[PDB]
Amino acid sequence: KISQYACQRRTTLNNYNQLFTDALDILAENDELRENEGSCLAFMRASSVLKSLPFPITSMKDTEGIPCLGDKVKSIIEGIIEDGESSEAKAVLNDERYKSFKLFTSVFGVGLKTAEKWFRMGFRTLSKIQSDKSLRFTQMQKAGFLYYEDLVSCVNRPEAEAVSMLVKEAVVTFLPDALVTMTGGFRRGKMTGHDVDFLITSPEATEDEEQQLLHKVTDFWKQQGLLLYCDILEDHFQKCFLILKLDHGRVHSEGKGWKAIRVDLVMCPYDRRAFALLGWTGSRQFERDLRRYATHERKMMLDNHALYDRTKRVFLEAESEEEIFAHLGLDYIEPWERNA
Numbered sequence: 001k002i003s004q005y006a007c008q009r010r011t012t013l014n015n016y017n018q019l020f021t022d023a024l025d026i027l028a029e030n031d032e033l034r035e036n037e038g039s040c041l042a043f044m045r046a047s048s049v050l051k052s053l054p055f056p057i058t059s060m061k062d063t064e065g066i067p068c069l070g071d072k073v074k075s076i077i078e079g080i081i082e083d084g085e086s087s088e089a090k091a092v093l094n095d096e097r098y099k100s101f102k103l104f105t106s107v108f109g110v111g112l113k114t115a116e117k118w119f120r121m122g123f124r125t126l127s128k129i130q131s132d133k134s135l136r137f138t139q140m141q142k143a144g145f146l147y148y149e150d151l152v153s154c155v156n157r158p159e160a161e162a163v164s165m166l167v168k169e170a171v172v173t174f175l176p177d178a179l180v181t182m183t184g185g186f187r188r189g190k191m192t193g194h195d196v197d198f199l200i201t202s203p204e205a206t207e208d209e210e211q212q213l214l215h216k217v218t219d220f221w222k223q224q225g226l227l228l229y230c231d232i233l234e235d236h237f238q239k240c241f242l243i244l245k246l247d248h249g250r251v252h253s254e255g256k257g258w259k260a261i262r263v264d265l266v267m268c269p270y271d272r273r274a275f276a277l278l279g280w281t282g283s284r285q286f287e288r289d290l291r292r293y294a295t296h297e298r299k300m301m302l303d304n305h306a307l308y309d310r311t312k313r314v315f316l317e318a319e320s321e322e323e324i325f326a327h328l329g330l331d332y333i334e335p336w337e338r339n340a
C-alpha cells in the first residue's frame with residue numbers, strides 16, 4: 001500500500017507520469033499565485049504520489065488504491081488520458097495573471113507582493129518594468145535585473161562543482177577543519193538547478209568564529225572581485241544569499257568569459273549538522289511530509305535545527321540523517337530517493 005507520506009515513498013528522477021505531473025504542477029503553481037493554499041496542497045500531494053509510481057497511468061483503473069487523488073485531480077487525470085493534454089493546465093498557461101506572476105517573480109528580489117503591484121499598474125513585460133522612469137527598485141531587484149539572463153539559465157553539474165571548489169577554497173582559508181557539503185537538488189541527483197546550496201559546519205570553531213565565517217568569506221570574494229551580490233540575513237541559522245562571478249576557465253565540462261551564479265551558504269553549529277543537512281537536501285514536498293509524519297504519527301517536532309519528543313519531553317540527538325530516520329521509526333530514504 002502506497003503511503004500518503006512522501007517520507008514513506010522512494011521517489012527517483014525516473015518519472016513515468018510526467019504528462020500528469022507537469023499539468024498538476026502548473027495547476028498547483030497557479031493556486032500558489034492566487035493564494036489558494038488548500039487547492040495548491042491538493043495538487044502538490046497528487047503530483048508527488050504519481051512521481052513515486054514505478055509504472056505510467058494508462059487508464060483510470062490504474063489509479064485504484066493510490067492515495068491523495070481527489071475528485072478534482074481524477075478529472076484532470078481522465079482528461080489527459082482522453083487526448084494527451086490538460087485543458088485546465090493549458091488555460092493556466094494562457095492566463096495573463098499567471099504569465100505575469102511567473103515572469104515577474106523570475107527576477108531575483110521580486111516576490112508575490114511586488115509582482116501583484118506591477119500587474120495592477122498594467123505592466124506585462126520586464127522591458128516595460130526596467131525602463132519605467134517612476135519605479136524604484138530594491139538593491140536585490142537591481143542585481144536581479146542586471147544578471148537576469150545568467151540567473152534565468154540553469155546551473156549544470158560542472159558549474160556547481162566549480163562553485164563548490166570556490167566555496168571550499170574560501171572557507172578553509174578561515175576555518176581549515178570546516179566541512180562543506182553541497183545540498184539541494186544537486187545532492188538529490190539533479191543535472192541542473194536555479195542555484196547551488198551549501199552547508200558549512202566546523203567541529204572546533206567557537207560561537208564567534210562560527211558567526212564571523214560568512215563575513216570573512218564574502219569580504220575575501222569582494223576583494224577578489226567575485227562578489228556580485230551579498231545578503232547575510234535570515235530556518236534560523238546564519239545564511240547568505242549570493243551572486244558569484246564564475247570564470248569559464250574554472251568549469252571543466254564564447255561569451256563575456258564568466259557567468260553569474262546564485263549561491264546560498266548556510267552555517268550551522270556542528271551538533272545540528274544532521275538536522276540542517278536533512279532540511280536543506282529537500283525536496284520541499286519530502287520535507288513537508290517528514291515534519292507532518294513526525295507530528296501526526298510520532299508526536300515529535302522536527303525542523304532544520306532539532307527533533308523533539310513531546311511524550312518523553314526530550315530532544316533527540318543525531319550525528320547523521322540515518323539516526324533521524326531511526327528516531328522517527330522510518331526506513332532510511334537515500335537523498336536521490338527524496339525527489340517527491
Ligand SMILES: Nc1ncnc2c1ncn2[C@@H]1O[C@H](COP(=O)(O)CP(=O)(O)OP(=O)(O)O)[C@@H](O)[C@H]1O
Pocket residue numbers: 184185186190192193194195197235279280281282283284287304
Ligand atoms: N529558507 C529556507 N529555510 C528552510 N529550508 C529551506 C530554505 N530554503 C530552502 N530550503 C530547503 O533547501 C533546498 C534548497 O533551496 P532552494 O534552492 O530554494 C530549492 P531546490 O528544489 O532544492 O533547488 P533547485 O533550484 O535546484 O530546484 C530545498 O529543497 C528546500 O526545501
Ligand SMILES: [Mg+2]
Pocket residue numbers: 183184185186193194195196197
Ligand atoms: Mg537548490
Ligand code: NA
Pocket residue numbers: 104105106107108109110111
Ligand atoms: Na523572485
Ligand SMILES: [Zn+2]
Pocket residue numbers: 184195196197263264
Ligand atoms: Zn538555494
Ligand SMILES: [Zn+2]
Pocket residue numbers: 236303304305306
Ligand atoms: Zn528551530
